[PDB]
Every structure is written in C-alpha cells, then in structure tokens.
Design a protein around this nucleic acid. Structure first.
Ligand SMILES: Nc1ncnc2c1ncn2[C@@H]1O[C@H](COP(=O)(O)OP(=O)(O)NP(=O)(O)O)[C@@H](O)[C@H]1O
Ligand SMILES: Nc1ncnc2c1ncn2[C@@H]1O[C@H](COP(=O)(O)OP(=O)(O)NP(=O)(O)O)[C@@H](O)[C@H]1O
Ligand SMILES: [Mg+2]
Ligand SMILES: [Mg+2]
Ligand SMILES: [Zn+2]
Lengths: 656, 613, 347
DNA sequence: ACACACTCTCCAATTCTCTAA
DNA sequence: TTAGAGAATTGGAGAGTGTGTTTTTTTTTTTTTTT
C-alpha cells in the first residue's frame, strides 16, 4: 500500500548495460560471444565484474560521472539477470552462417501462428520461450578488490545476506542426479485448432483447462485443451548440499550446511568430497497455497549457483596451454629435475633423500596394461615405511598428503575394515538398504595414507587385499550385490615388533607381516635410529635453524614451489613410455639372480622372504615411472639400473 | 493513544539527564562509521534499572509491571536520540529502509521478580522477570520475514509492506498471512526486491532448574525462551545462564473449538531481552594488575617464587613443581608456509611408590588451569577418550573437549593396551581421525597431558632395569617430555620434617570462624592465574644464536655419551629442550630466549633423565 | 486404590483428577490421602466418555529442652563406655569393634586450605555374628544404605554404562552420598568395582569417560564392610569378629523368639549423633602434634632397624578428632591421642 | 484462501398456436 | 398456402453458498561396553 523513495533508477543502469555490452574491450569483447550465440555455437554467457569495474574507471578517467553498477548488481543481484537478458535480446546480431532452421519445432509453430494472424488480419508469446542461452555473473577478483571476493564459512551466512551475491567455502556432502524442470508449457485446443502457452516460476502450478482465446470465445467454441511436450521448454536441474570444514567447527557445536541449486550448462560440476569455493545468489523459498496461510513468517532458504572454483586441479583436468608450457620449459632447461623435485618434498626434514625419491615415484606411478584377451595388470605403486620411533615417519607421510590432488589420511586404530572399504547401511527411516563407499573409494585415482599400520587389527587388514592388487571392491550382502572401482595407491607406516628394532632376531621376525600382504608392497623401506655424534650435531643445527626462522637453511638449493611441482607431475602422467628388447633382456636376467639368491639364503639372518613374480613387475613399474619423469617415450637401461638401486638401498639399514 | 507521546517525552528527559547513555550511543556510532570506510557493533544499550528508579518512580514501576505499555515508547525515544545525532550521508538502497531501530537491555535490583523455573507461576504473567538455570536444548537458527519491498514495472514507484507474528511484538495485533503481493492496487504487475527487504534471525532454547535444587528426586521443571537478532547462538547446551525478559502467554488454549473440553492450559514463554552467563574459566585484568605483573617480573629469582607458590601444602618435590609451571606456560606453536606443523605443548609423566603425593599433586593442576579435564585410566575407553560414532553424527571424547587446555590422567597403569594406542596420534599430531561405516572426518585436540602411574612390582626396584619396572613401550615413553621417578625412602630427619609439616597443615582455621566451629614470600593463586594468563597472551619469545649454541652441544653429548639413562633419547629430545627454554623465557616476560633459559632447561632435563644433579 | 482393599490376584485400579489455585502443589507421590470432590466425565466405541474427579478438599532442628539432655550426656565421665555398651547389646564381647563403630558414626573434621586442597572427614572400617552389626549400624545412623557385593543393578557398587543410545547409572556408592553405606559381603564385589572403589574411597569421586559420556560423580561417604590382599590398604581400621558359646545366651534368644512368635535407646542416640555432627568440629592442640610426630618417627625407626606411611598418620588424626567430638571439646588432647593409637592396633 | 461440489434463480431461445391475405 | 403476431415451455448462464486442506515385534549390518 505505501511507497518510498530510493537512490537507484533502473533506466540509467539499463543504459549503462547496453553501452557496456557494445563498447568494452580488453572488436568489443561481448559481441564476439553474441555472434557465437547467434550462430548456435555457444550456449552460455559469463559476465566478468572485473570488466565493469575497469569500464567504470575508464569512463571516470575520461572526465564523466557514472553509476557504480558493480555494487548495484552485488547488492540486489536477482533483478539484473533480467536486465542483461533484455539488453542481449535487443542487441543480438544476425547469424554469420547457415543454420538449418527447419530443425526447430518452435520456429515452425511460431511461423505458422504468425501466418494465422496475418490471414486473420486480412505480446504474442513469452520471450523466455526463445532464449537459446544461459547467463551467469563471475565475482570480483580479490586482488582488484568487496564481499563477493571474500569467502564465508557456512556459519557466517546470516539473514542479512538474503538477495545478495556471495562466495562460500566448504565440502560437498551429497549430489542429486539430473531431472528436467518446466519453464514454459504449451497446449493445443482441439475444436478451433489454436495454441496457448503458460509460464511456470513457483514449485507447483495448475494446468489450464479452457480455451479463453477471444476468437474461440466469440465463435462460442468451448473447446478442450491438451498438453504437449514437443513444443514445451525445459531446463536441466540438479540439487546439492555443502557443509563447513571440520577444522573450522567451534568446540561443542554440530556442523551446519546449505542447499545449492544448479541450472543450465553449469550442471554436474560439483561432486561429493570436493573442497570448493562456490559463489552464487542467496535467496528465500516461499510457500504456496493453503500451506502459506499457516506456515508463519519463518522462511526456508538456498543458494543459486553462478560459478565454481576448485582448490586443487585434478590430474584429469590438465591441458598444455602455452602458459603451462612456458613454466615446464623452466624445469626442462634447468635440468636434473629428478633430484630437484625429490629434494623439494618437505624441505623442513633433513636428509632421508632416498625415501623422498621413492615417494616421488609413488606420486608418478607406472603404466596401466590391458591384454587382448581381457586380462589387466595393476599400474599403481604401493609403498611402506618400517622404522624406529622418532624418525619423522608420520611427519613425512602427512607432508605428501598436501601435494596429491586427491588423497586421504587415516590411522590404524581409528579405522574399521568396513569404513575403510565400503559399508551397507540401513540408513533411511524407510528401512531401505544403501551402499556407501569408504576411504579407499574416496581415494579413487589418488593416494591413501595409513598411519599406525601395525596397530590395526589382523582381521580388518585383510579387507585391503582385494583393493591393493585388483583395484576393485566386491560386496554381496542383504539386498546389495555389486562391484565398485578403487584405483588407489596405498602408502603405510609402522614400528617393528616390540617398538624399537631388535637386532637379536631376523628382519622377518621384526617386520611381523604375513607373506601375502608383504608381497603387495612394491617397496618396503627399513629405517633405523642409530646414534652418531657427527650426524646428530648436523641434524640439530638444521632443526634449530628452522625453529628460529620458519625457513629451511639454504646456501645452494632453492626448492620448486608445490604449484609448479604439480604442473610438472601432471604433465608427466600422460606419456606411456614403452619397453624395448635390449631392456627386456637385462631385466629378465636380473630376475633370475634375485630368485636364486633368495633360495640360497631362506635360512639366513639376512633373509627377507622369497622373491615372487610380483617382484618382476615391481621393477617394470619403477622403471616406467623414472621414464615418465624425464618426459621420454621409451624406457632406457639407465632407468632400470636406478630402479634396481632404489630397491637395494632399502635393506642397507640392517648393516649399521 | 495520546499517552504514548507523553511516555516518549518522559524517557527523552531521562536520556538527557543521565548523560552516560549518550556517550554509549555516540561511541557505537562513530566506531561503526569508521570501519565502514575500510566486526560491526550491535545497535543495543544496557540501562541500569536503579537510575530509572531514582529519576522517576512512576516510570520505573511501569517498566517493571506493565512492560508491554512502557518498553516500546522508551525504545522509540532511544532511536530518536541516535537518529538526531550526526550520521554518514548518502545511504544505500538497503540502508534507507532497513526497519532497524535501537534496542534496550537491563541490569540491577529486580527484587521480588528474580526467580527460577520451579517457582515461575501464573501470577507473574505479563511481568518483566529474571530466571536462572541450565540450557538443555537449542533450535537451529532460522531467518524470519518482517518487511518486503516491491518495484512497480510501469509507474516506476517502489512499494513496501510489513508483517507481524505473536512472538515479534510485545503488544498484540491481527496476524499476517505471509503472502507476497503480485499485483498493484492499480493493476500493475509487481516484482519483489530481495536485498531491500528485511529478514531477522530467530532461535528457541530451553532452560531447566539446576540439579542442585531438585527436591526429593522429583521431576525437574523447565521453560522455553525466544531469542532474535543479536542474541542468537550466544549459548550452547550445559551452560549455566541468567535470562531477563517478559513472561507471556500464547494461542487459543482450546477455546477455539476442540475435543479437550478445555481442560488443557494456554502456552507460555519468556521473550529474551538480555542474557548473562554464570561462572560456576577467564579473568579480565585491571590497570593495577599490569603494573604489578611487570614490576614483579624484574626480581632476581621469579621462577623460584612462583614455583614454590604452587601447592604449598605439599612438602618437597621442587623439580616437579617447576616442571608443572613450565607446562602451564608452554612453548610456541609453529605453522610453516608449506602447511607443515611443529608441536608446542609439553607432556609430563610421573611414576612412583604408594602414598607419595602423586594423586594429590596431580589434583592441584585441575584447580589452577583455565581449562582442565580429569579422568582415571581404567574408567575410560579409547573411543571415549578420543571420539565415538552415534545417531551419522560423530561425538567428541575427553581429549577433543580439552582442546587448548590440560588433561589429567590418574591410575595410568590400569589402562588396557587396546585403550593406550588410541592416544599415540593425539600427543604428536594433535588431531583425531575416524574412518568408520558412513563417516570420515578429522578433529583438533591440541592439549597437554599430565599423568601418574604405579611401577610394575608395586614399589620401584632399583635392582632391576627401568624397562622392567616401567611396562610401557618405547614409542609411548618417547612422547612424554619429562619422566619423573619418585620413592618413599625411609630416613629419620625426612620423616620428622614431613610429619611436622602435615601436622602444621591440619591445624589451619579459616578466617571467619571460632575454634571448633564447623566450616621468603608466596604470591596468592588468584594473582598467579592472572600472571600465567597475561604471560601466555602478551609475550611470544623468539629464539637466539646464544641459546642455540647451548642446545646443540647438550643434545649431541646427552645422546652419544653412554650412561644408565631412564628414557630413550631421540629427535624428540631436542624439541623438548627448545620447548623448555622457550617456556622459561616466557616466565621471565622476555621478548627473546637467552643463554640463561637454555642453561636452566638443560639442568632440568638432566635431573629428570639421568637422575642426579 | 488402597493396597489392603484390592481383591486377590488383581492389580490395583486408579483414577485421574484435577485441582486449582490453593489446592495445587500440596501433596507429593507415595502419600496416602483422603479426597472430597465432584465425580464427573469428560471427552477424549459409541456414546462413551472417560471419568475423573474435581477436587474440593484434601487431607493427608532441636528445641532447648532437647539439647539440655545432650549437654548433660556430654559431661558424663563415662560417656564413651555408655555409647559402646548401647551398640548391638545382644552381641557378646567384641569391645573394640563397638568402639570403632562409634568412631565411624561420629567421624573426623573436614578442612579446606588457601591453596584449595581439601582434607577428608569420613572414616572407613572392615570386619573379618557379623551380619547383625551392619543392620544395627543401618538403624542407628542418620542416613544409611545396605547392600550385598553384587549390587542392586548392573551399576554394581560404583557405576557403569549401559545400552539404542548409551546411558549411565550409579550404584550404591553414589546413592549413599552424604551418609553411611554398609556392604554385606565385600568379597562378592564385581571386577569393575574392584578397580573403581580406589577412586571412590581416596578421592570421594567416581569419574567416567566412555562411549561419549564424560562426567564425574560425588561419593562423599563413610564405608563399613565385611568379608569371610592389597585392598585392605584403603581402610582406616580392620578387625576380625570373635565368638563365644554360652548356652544361656542362645536360650535367652530362643525365649525371646518364642515371646514374639506367641545405656541409650536408638532414637535418642541417633538424635545425639546428629546434634554432635552439627555443633562441633574440633582441632589438635600443640601437645598432640609433638606426641603424634614423635610416635610416627619412633615406629618408622623401629621398623627400619628390624610400613607406616603418611596416609596412615592422616587416619590416626581423623580418629583422634572423632574421639574428642563426643565430649564436645573444641580442642583434642593427649587423652584422645593415647586412645587413638591404642585403638589403632588392627594387625 | 484457494479449488471444488452443489443449489438456486432469471432470462431468452425455441416451438406451438391463431389469424388474415 | 404463406407468413407474422402472441403465448407457453425449457436450458443453462452464471451467480451464489458451503465445504476441506497443514501436521511389539521380526530380520540384518555395525559399533560399543560388558564378562
Ligand atoms: N631428519 C629430521 N629432520 C627434521 N625433524 C626430524 C627429523 N627426524 C626426526 N625429526 C623430528 O621428529 C619428531 C617426531 O616425528 P614423527 O613423524 O612424529 O615421528 P614418527 O616417525 O612418526 N615416530 P612414531 O610415530 O613414534 O613411530 C618431529 O618433530 C620431527 O621434527
Ligand atoms: N608432603 C607429603 N608427602 C607425601 N604425602 C603427603 C604429603 N602431604 C600430604 N600427604 C598425604 O599423602 C596421602 C596420599 O597422597 P596421594 O597423592 O593419594 O598419594 P599417591 O601417590 O596418589 N598414592 P597412591 O594413591 O597409592 O598411588 C594423602 O592423604 C595426602 O594428604
Ligand atoms: Mg608417527
Ligand atoms: Mg593417591
Ligand atoms: Zn479454442
């Protein structure tokens, strides 16, 4: 009933929008996109607010006043999706190329309807019915920066923000599968042969049932309406949920969450377990009909997604733009990348260089193989660290957990073999049975870190056997019978029996693992804490420096930063280097010697069990990883001898 | 109607007379106006109910007996005062029509209206009351609509409307249907302007009488409270709290036609006006405290004074007292630029004969640390001590609850092997991680551990190895910074001294009591708590080359020289030296660690480790 | 309905009823009452309604002259003998057992220090015929609980966690808080209670951190126990019951049994014990301190040339205070110290 | 307040009848 | 034989009224404390 004044007039802002779309350039930037839309080449338009800020600054420096459109579309974001769409529809250019127009049902229907009106004469339909494109806003760069550039945790999203454009940081908990949602519905009248349309915005609607057209009415033609899919307009819909990071929850509270909606080409971007910076519009969800009359003033709410930024680029997302090319050329031209990359893993830890080199080869991994008859062979590498207390095992393990784009960390005592693999939970109130994957599934195509491996129960450790070699999980339980994919490499850490390693016994007595499991690790590294006045002094001088400066001590060596390291590793995981006959003869001859030496010494104090055929393929996998890191397309004997050295060094700790 | 204006005038006279409230309005406004140009303070003021009594008794009793007729005009007058004071020009679209007035809160002298949930009675309805109890439940936060704004497409005019519900206002009005208008009076189609509309936060809680007051094992009684705007989420379950607000009734009570024959009663609530906690830990320093703390720190031997003032009722064990003081101060926690973490908190273990004050000394820490949890070793399971699953929801254990605090474990030797191994992560990585059916999560647990145990043979046997006397694995003993062995060696003068000491202790009488009625210098514990709090918040000592020169030499000699030492020596021993030196420098309020601190830390570690100084 | 009215083999019938204004909050559960009210029906089959009643009416520290008697008792020169004689008078002999029960009923004095440490007031005794004394103690004590070693539930003596969500319940150590508790066979204690009673006795608390529960329970009580090892160290005094076989005693008991089949009284003594606990909490004189410390070092030296420990010196002090409490003397004296060490011969 | 089921009422469309050219 | 003036019978347009709606196992997988 009443009315107020406000500082904003939308006519001025509409004029600014139509100038911006036809003038801005880094021809003008957005007219190329609209030409691609007109050619049917492109389905969505992404508006950059950095452009609008730049445009405002340039117009100001030319000595003229202008409205602050950037804050104006952040404060009340919902309304401007319509203004930009009307401007785009007004200014859309004509096609540059032939289209085959007859493929469109709506074109035929509207052409015939226009012809009917033309004959009869001897808005027509809602404009939403012919918008072939989607439109989204991208928030301000924080380095140019405003609230949309600054991430909020899910607790900080108060009721003040309803209507605004914001950014949210958290973990995704669940994702729905895609289904269609109506936008414009189409009907046919039987007796008078005429078509009518209806537009849907709310969660529910009543379909039409009477032909209220004036011509039909004046012919007293009370015809029947029928619905049609073939000329209705749908859009893809998906719903998700986001939840705050566990390390940001205040003490004694339960974590909170938000509902996310996604439409258009942005669909199936999110996935469960992702850590992500989502940005969008935060809105209420009104009730409808009789429910609204007795629901009260408490409103449900949700987030309309507009753009999504991931924290770590998955290795599958790689493509060699020249921006990346220029950076990998730095490492390639500098040379000796193997040592530099290994030295760059956890620089705050002194020494341990061979362990770091082994863990770099774990990050790269071997080549997947699939024979013409259907047999397949594991490409992943498995590694284990066995050693005394206080030698940085947990610390080094947790450092590698940062580099990998997909990975999880777990400890032996806190873990169930079920929850480690996959569980059949009677989760809903409806008594339904549903399968939910465990840690080894969440680490699919990544690394799984298992600390305190010696504390985990002997029965529960057997769950890992199938995943380690076959990279799959098989379940046959109440109402569920399926196989899941688990393409994951395992890294584990343990103390020997009795804690500190005991020289009175053999290595196998100290290790205390069964034969079938000890074989599934490609490398097991044995590391012992033996005092030395000389080495202890150097280690202490290094650690004390680190505590003093927060920096590793350096005179010669500069580590590569983790980002450039990820780019190099991601580029290196694409190569698939092949073997050759000269190399094959050498490794074939090496394998015989290993088994003969094992047979000779099964009695001996220097025994470590017997070399199985899985030790041959371990050599091939390590060799191929080394070939990948030098960006080759061919394994070289130089790789094989290093792969043998790296296996030999694991046992030298036994000899003080 | 006319009476509303006069009440606004009379409260304006009060606000002009008692000027300390104008300063409050103005200071909040200028603070908010400053940082807006770069957190924000709420538009709320607390008035002393005594000032209002001395100013006008007729207004005082009106606020206190008829709040629905006196609180609204008073609050209106406060908003006019804040609005007439100068404010930033050219407000934005949302600021122009925020629908956000200032709000009141009260303190002091409620008299007869200070109550508890058991005694709140139908006579007190519509009065302003104060209640005390324990929070038991809290709802989720929800937004609530109060105003909406609409733009008319053809005419270019902005329209608006307001909404009400029975819990939003002290006075009573016709309820509103929560519908959005789609069309103008003149037939123009409307659009809704989110971001210009106004929504507020809402939360319901429940408060119950304290269990100490429950009669005869009878059922306890409780009330529901309504909170909104600024008051949301300032409490959690288990809090002891005192709430101020108006006590009111709701609904039709079955007189709107029902099957009950109207035997059922009306519903009732308290509308939260102000909330205060109860202490049942933290203290806030006055200026004089800063002066005294800084002056005392320049004595020659502050460490001796402070350490001997811990548990003066316990004779002897000087070194354990010094170790506990350094534990309460702690080291400095490091986070490196690559995300790597280096531990800061000190863990202590003590093992010894029966009756040698182990449990009695362990009990003292629980009553001087700001956050402390206590448990017996056999009364706790691995999951209960770290974390457990429920319904999926994950529930914290004792080590997760004391995050930045200390945890005390008595009868540590009785804990089973299956329970002990759950602790190996928490004492170094300072986290808890679970991987069970339907759950994977990491939790933080940053505390310091102090614990007591009995040796294997019931008394310590010097004629057998320390490993034979102490049945724990080497990987666990390595995680304790200081390991103390203590025994009851029989000697004449020692026995005489201790016995005379406990007899002098048992002859104490508290100050306010006649004899037989039932109930160097030492700083008082209430001052020592302030000293520890100040030192832990305001000083962060950085390491120096002179300290490092001592630390490196001591570590390499101690590790390499062959001796009958009672604990394994590893890379973690070096960190114990750095932590102890940093904590001693912090006692001294020094901005940097010096050679003296490193020397003292070495002389404490040598005593505990090699048994002799 | 009244228990002595119900027809045999049937569970009792009941009614629901309403009251308002001054008739509210006038009664509590378990009380027998008489009611006047209108009997009527209300809405809540065919043409059928529930009945109820509207109520219109319901029916259901010391004086000066009391404490004068207690004061006259306090100045009697043989009061200690009188109270010992008044305890289980049918039981022959066993003088020191009766003396120890008097001290257990009277207790020492609680104290709190400037550094916040807290000093225990209670007493604990163990007995190795014996069934009668625990029942007598249960009757004479102002507050009392009686149990056998297995306990009344899966809580046992101390407490336990049970299960569906988990919960916790306390046994007969938590329930007797503030009073006395007596155990009828201490050897039948359960495994969890064997370890948990250490905290319950030394700390006067029970603490649990299991299945997400994290709480501490109060256990402020004096324990009397009997049976038929290291657990004896928890008690202040231990004694073994003794018997005599006079035929006249059994004949007298049998004659009394036939009579039912065909010195100070309990209530007065209970009220006196209550009065003394409320009025007096006495302190050691310096002479007692020199005496006790000299005796302590003497016993340790004698044992060294041939154990006593501080946790037993602090028990002798509590016994000494409890002996001075009978006289209402505000100070304890060498007279009490002598009888305290004399009675300390548990062996 | 929002789709439905059911009731009530008035008005004009229709067919039938009579009269005269 | 056509047609036009007047009367009677019926249909359904459409207006009105009242109404209803939100909201002890038994079998099977998994974690936890208890003997
Ligand atoms: N070479 C090293 N360089 C730097 N710090 C080291 C080195 N070796 C050991 N440390 C320190 O040793 C401490 C303990 O490391 P941590 O990873 O917890 O040991 P761990 O091998 O997991 N021992 P445990 O879990 O008992 O088997 C850390 O603070 C490290 O800084
Ligand atoms: N200076 C002291 N030295 C030793 N014990 C003392 C001292 N002062 C008091 N005590 C008393 O010693 C008794 C036993 O102390 P407590 O701390 O329980 O020993 P403990 O080491 O825990 N023995 P235990 O429970 O068998 O492991 C208490 O009653 C204390 O009051
Ligand atoms: Mg570790
Ligand atoms: Mg003790
Ligand atoms: Zn039609």
């Amino acid at each position: 009933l009443p009315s107020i004044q406000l500082p904003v007039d939308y006519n001025n802002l509409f004029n600014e929008i139509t100038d911006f779309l036809v003038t801005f350039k880094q021809g003008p930037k957005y007219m190329a996109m609209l030409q691609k839309v007109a050619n049917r080449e492109l389905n969505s338009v992404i508006i950059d607010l950095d452009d609008i800020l730049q445009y405002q600054n340039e117009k100001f420096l030319q000595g003229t006043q202008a409205d602050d459109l950037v804050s104006a579309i952040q404060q009340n974001a919902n309304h401007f999706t319509e203004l930009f769409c009307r401007a785009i529809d007004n200014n859309m250019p004509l096609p540059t190329k032939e289209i085959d127009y007859k493929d469109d049902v709506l074109d035929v229907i509207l052409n015939q309807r226009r012809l009917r009106n033309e004959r009869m004469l001897s808005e027509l339909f809602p404009p939403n019915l012919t918008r072939r494109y989607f439109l989204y806003f991208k928030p301000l760069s924080q380095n140019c920066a405003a609230i949309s550039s600054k991430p909020l945790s899910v607790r900080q999203i108060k009721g003040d923000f309803l209507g605004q454009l914001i950014t949210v940081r958290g973990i995704i908990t669940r994702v729905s599968d895609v289904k269609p949602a109506v936008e414009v519905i189409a009907y046919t009248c039987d007796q008078c042969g005429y078509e009518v349309f209806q537009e849907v915005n709310s969660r529910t609607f009543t379909p039409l049932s009477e032909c209220t057209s004036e011509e039909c009415s004046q012919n007293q033609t009370k015809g029947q309406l029928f619905m049609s899919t073939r000329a209705s307009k749908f859009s893809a819909f998906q719903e998700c949920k986001i939840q705050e990071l566990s390390q940001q929850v205040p003490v004694g509270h339960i974590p909170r969450s938000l509902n996310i909606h996604v439409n258009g080409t942005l669909v199936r971007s999110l996935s469960p377990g992702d850590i992500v910076d989502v940005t969008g519009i935060f809105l209420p969800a009104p009730y409808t009909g009789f429910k609204a009359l007795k629901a009260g003033l408490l409103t449900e709410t949700y987030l309309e997604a507009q753009f999504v930024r991931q924290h770590k680029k998955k290795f599958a997302s790689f493509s060699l733009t020249s921006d990346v090319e220029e950076r990998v050329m730095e490492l390639i031209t500098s040379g000796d990348v193997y040592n530099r990359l290994a030295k760059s893993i956890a620089p705050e830890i002194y020494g341990n260089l061979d362990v770091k080199k082994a863990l770099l080869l774990l990050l790269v991994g071997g080549v997947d193989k699939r024979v013409g008859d259907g047999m397949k062979i594991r490409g992943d590498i498995n590694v284990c660290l066995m050693g005394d207390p206080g030698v940085a095992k947990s610390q080094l393990l947790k450092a590698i957990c940062k580099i990998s784009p997909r990975g999880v960390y777990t400890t032996g005592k806190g873990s169930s073999g079920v929850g480690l693999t996959a569980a059949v939970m009677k989760d809903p109130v409806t008594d339904e049975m549903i399968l939910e994957g465990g840690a080894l599934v969440l680490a699919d195509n990544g690394i799984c870190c298992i600390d305190e491996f010696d504390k985990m129960d002997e029965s529960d450790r057997t769950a890992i056997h199938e995943v380690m070699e076959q990279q799959t999980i098989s379940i046959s339980k109440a109402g569920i019978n399926t196989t899941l994919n688990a393409r994951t490499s395992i890294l584990a850490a343990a103390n020997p029996l009795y804690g500190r390693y005991n020289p009175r016994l053999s290595p196998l007595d100290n290790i205390n693992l069964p034969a079938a499991l000890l074989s599934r690790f490609d490398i097991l590294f044995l590391m012992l804490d033996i005092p030395s006045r000389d080495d202890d002094e150097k280690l202490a001088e290094h650690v004390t420096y680190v505590h003093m400066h927060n920096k590793q001590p350096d005179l010669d060596f500069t580590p590569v930063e983790p980002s450039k390291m990820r780019e190099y590793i991601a580029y290196a995981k694409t190569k698939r280097p092949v073997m050759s006959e000269a190399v094959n003869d050498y490794v074939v001859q090496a394998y015989i010697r290993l088994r003969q030496d094992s047979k000779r010494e099964m009695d001996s104090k220097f025994s470590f069990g017997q070399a199985t055929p899985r030790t041959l393929l371990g050599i091939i996998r390590l060799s191929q990883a080394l070939a990948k890191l030098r960006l080759a397309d061919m394994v070289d004997i130089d790789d094989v001898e290093e792969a043998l050295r790296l296996v030999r060094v694991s046992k030298e700790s036994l000899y003080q | 109607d006319a009476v509303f204006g006069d009440r606004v005038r009379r409260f304006q006279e009060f606000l002009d007379t008692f000027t300390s409230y104008r300063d409050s309005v103005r200071s909040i406004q200028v603070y908010n106006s400053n940082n807006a140009a770069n957190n924000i303070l709420p538009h709320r003021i607390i008035i002393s109910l005594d000032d209002l009594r001395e100013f006008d008794r007729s207004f005082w009793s009106g606020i206190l007996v008829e709040p629905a007729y006196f609180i609204p005009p008073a609050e209106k007058a406060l908003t006019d005062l804040a609005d007439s004071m100068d404010d930033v020009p050219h407000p934005n679209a949302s600021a122009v029509s925020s629908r956000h007035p200032w709000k009141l809160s009260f303190k002091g002298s409620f008299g007869a209206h200070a109550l508890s949930p058991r005694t709140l009675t139908a006579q007190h309805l519509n009065k302003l009351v104060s209640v005390e109890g324990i929070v038991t439940k809290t709802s989720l936060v929800r937004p609530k609509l109060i105003r909406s704004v609409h733009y008319a497409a053809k005419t270019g005019r902005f329209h608006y409307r307001d909404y009400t519900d029975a819990t939003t206002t002290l006075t009573t009005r016709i309820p509103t249907p929560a519908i959005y208008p789609t069309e103008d009076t003149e037939g123009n189609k409307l659009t809704t302007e989110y971001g210009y509309s106004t929504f507020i936060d809402h939360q319901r809680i429940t408060v119950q009488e304290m269990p100490e007051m429950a009669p005869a094992g009878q059922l306890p009684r409780s009330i529901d409270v309504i909170l909104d705007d600024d008051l949301v989420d300032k409490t959690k379950p288990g809090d002891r709290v005192n709430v101020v607000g108006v006590f009111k009734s709701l609904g039709a009570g079955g007189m709107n036609q029902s099957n009950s024959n109207t035997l059922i009663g009306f519903k009732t609530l308290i509308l939260g006006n102000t909330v205060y906690p109860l202490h049942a830990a933290r203290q806030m320093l006055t200026d004089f405290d800063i002066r005294n703390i800084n002056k005392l720190s320049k004595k020659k031997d502050i460490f001796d004074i402070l350490s001997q003032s811990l548990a003066p009722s316990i004779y002897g064990h000087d070194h354990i007292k010094k170790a506990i003081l350094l534990m309460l101060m702690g080291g400095v926690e490091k986070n490196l630029e690559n995300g790597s973490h280096l531990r800061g908190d000190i863990n202590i273990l003590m093992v010894g004969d029966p009756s040698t004050a182990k449990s009695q000394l362990l009990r003292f820490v629980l009553n001087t640390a700001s956050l402390a949890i206590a448990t017996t070793g056999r009364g706790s399971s691995g999951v209960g001590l770290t974390a457990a699953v429920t319904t999926r929801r994950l529930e914290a254990g004792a080590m997760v609850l004391a995050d930045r605090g200390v945890v005390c474990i008595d009868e540590f030797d009785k804990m089973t092997d299956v329970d002990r191994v759950a602790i190996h992560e928490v004492m170094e990585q300072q986290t808890v991680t679970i991987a069970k059916a339907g759950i994977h999560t990491t939790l933080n647990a940053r505390c310091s551990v102090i614990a007591a145990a009995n040796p294997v043979f019931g008394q310590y046997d010097v004629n057998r190895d320390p490993h034979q006397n102490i049945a724990l694995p080497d990987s666990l003993l390595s995680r304790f910074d200081l390991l103390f062995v203590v025994t009851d060696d029989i000697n004449e003068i020692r026995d005489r001294s201790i016995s005379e000491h406990v007899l002098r202790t048992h002859r104490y009488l508290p100050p306010g009591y006649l004899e037989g009625e039932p109930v160097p210098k030492l700083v008082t514990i209430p001052f020592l708590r302030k000293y520890v709090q100040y030192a832990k918040e305001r000083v962060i000592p950085q390491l120096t080359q002179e300290a490092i020169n001592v630390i490196v030499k001591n570590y390499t000699d101690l590790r390499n020289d062959d001796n009958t030492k009672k604990s394994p020596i590893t890379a973690r021993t070096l960190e114990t030296l750095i932590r102890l030196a940093t904590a001693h420098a912090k006692v001294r309020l020094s901005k940097t660690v010096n050679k003296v601190d490193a020397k003292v830390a070495a002389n404490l570690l040598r005593f505990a480790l090699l048994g002799e100084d | 309905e009244i228990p002595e009215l119900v027809p045999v083999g049937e569970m009792p019938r009941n009614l629901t009823m309403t009251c308002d204004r001054y008739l509210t909050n006038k009664v509590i559960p378990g009380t027998r009452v008489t009611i006047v009210g209108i009997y009527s029906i209300y809405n809540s089959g065919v043409a059928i309604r529930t009945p109820y009643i509207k109520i219109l009416g319901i029916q259901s520290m010391f004086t000066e002259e009391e404490e004068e008697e207690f004061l006259q008792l306090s100045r009697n020169p043989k009061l200690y003998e009188i109270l010992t004689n008044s305890i289980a008078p049918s039981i022959f002999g066993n003088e020191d057992i009766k003396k120890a029960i008097v001290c257990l009923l009277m207790g020492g004095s609680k104290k709190i220090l400037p550094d916040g440490m807290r000093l225990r007031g209670d007493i604990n005794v163990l007995l190795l015929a014996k069934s009668q004394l625990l029942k007598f103690v249960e009757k004479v004590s102002p507050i009392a609980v009686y149990t056998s070693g297995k306990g009344s539930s899966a809580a046992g003596l101390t407490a336990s966690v049970q299960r569906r969500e988990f919960y916790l319940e306390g046994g007969a150590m938590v329930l007797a808080d503030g009073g006395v508790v007596c155990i009828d066979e201490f050897d039948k204690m359960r495994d969890e209670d064997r370890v948990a009673i250490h905290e319950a006795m030394e700390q006067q608390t029970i603490s649990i951190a299991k299945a997400g529960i994290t709480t501490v329970l109060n256990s402020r009580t004096s324990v009397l126990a009997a049976a038929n090892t290291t657990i004896l160290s928890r008690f202040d005094m231990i004694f073994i019951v003794k018997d005599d076989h006079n035929e006249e005693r059994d004949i007298s008991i049998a004659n009394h049994v036939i009579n039912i089949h065909t010195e100070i009284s309990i209530e007065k003594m209970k009220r006196y014990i209550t009065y003394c606990r409320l009025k007096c909490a006495p302190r050691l004189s310096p002479q007692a301190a020199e005496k006790l410390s000299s005796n302590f070092v003497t016993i340790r030296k004698q044992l060294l040339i041939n154990p006593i420990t501080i946790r037993q010196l602090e028990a002798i002090i509590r016994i000494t205070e409890s002996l001075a409490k009978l006289e209402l003397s505000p100070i304890a004296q060498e007279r009490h110290v002598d009888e305290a060490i004399r009675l300390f011969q548990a062996s």
